[PDB]
Amino acid sequence: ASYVKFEVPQDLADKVLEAVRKAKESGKIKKGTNETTKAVERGQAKLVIIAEDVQPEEIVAHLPLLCDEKKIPYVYVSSKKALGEACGLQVATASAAILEPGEAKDLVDEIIKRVNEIKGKT
């Protein structure tokens, strides 16, 4: 896909899906592309999760651009069905956001730092 900026190894992708689930339980998440958009526009989100198999690619293509303006970090997962079913839904989701990590703070902070390393930085 062409809206995918960098490469996410599956160990990370799994640690992402985990971080989200704990965030449903103990914190606050947002699920769905439109609700994710508002979360970035409003600067509430700490981490934005985007799926790699969205089926018109362009549906989530605006998120990388939006996230960089508001300087909120984003990450990819391979399956949309997997992210939605993480989210506490029985249907797919193309993107989600974590607003308050709760009992995933440590888990999230490691993710937003690993995606920094495999992006450039130091």
Partner: protein
């Protein structure tokens, strides 16, 4: 409110209604702003507020950049002009005398650079790839400053290549080192050391190395002199 000169030409600070201090430049095209920035009148002269969070040059200043080689009537080659945020400020600094050649290879973005450069006689936009200076050889001259902010793994090499084309001997190069776009895996601090060595192993004389933190994560800027 109060506006006053700083150690560096055509760069000013404001005392504010509340007591904050923000950088600004003298507005070359009064009544008109390039991004959303605040326009400020003081003693009948208009200044553009220079947000450090957007412009790596302002960032470098606020992180104590010794001496700024961009001044009144300076000739600058600006690799990675992007949308025109920073280059508009070096337009202001340089004034009608000096000139700024803005190299940028992304059309989606040069789109908005056009609008900036229309209003500004200082700025000579170029939709070209900075890896081939041959493809803008025919428009530019030699220059005092090579300001380089390009997202590329071999960004340092690219910069050097342009330097031996267009950078006057004893001219200055401001090189933005983007760690996470050279290698996301490596430590930003290892990268800064190795890229500065490339400049030294050519013949650039490192003058100052700044870390752009608060303002830019995993970035550093190098000021050095070409020989």
């Amino acid at each position: 409110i109060t506006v006053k000169q700083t150690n560096m030409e055509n760069i000013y600070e404001c005392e504010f209604n509340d007591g904050s201090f923000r950088l600004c430049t003298r507005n070359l095209v009064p009544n008109f702003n390039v991004y959303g920035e605040r326009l400020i009148k003081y003693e009948g002269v208009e200044y553009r507020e220079w947000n450090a969070f957007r412009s790596k040059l302002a960032g470098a200043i606020l992180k104590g950049l010794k001496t700024n080689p961009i001044r009144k009537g300076t000739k600058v080659l600006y690799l990675g002009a992007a949308s025109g945020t920073t280059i508009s400020h070096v337009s202001d600094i340089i004034e009608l005398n000096g000139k700024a050649y803005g190299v940028e290879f992304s059309p989606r973005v040069v789109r908005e650079l056009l609008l900036v450069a229309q209003r500004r006689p200082n700025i000579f936009p170029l939709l070209a790839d900075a890896r081939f200076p041959q493809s803008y050889k025919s428009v530019v001259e030699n220059v005092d400053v090579l300001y380089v902010d390009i997202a590329q793994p071999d960004q340092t090499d690219i910069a050097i290549y342009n330097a031996k084309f267009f950078l006057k001997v004893n001219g200055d190069m401001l090189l933005v080192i983007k760690a996470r776009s050279i290698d996301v895996t490596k430590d930003p601090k290892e990268i800064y050391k190795t890229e500065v060595e490339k400049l030294e192993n050519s013949n650039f004389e490192t003058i100052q190395i700044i870390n752009l933190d608060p303002y830019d994560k995993d970035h550093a800027i190098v000021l050095s002199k070409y020989k």
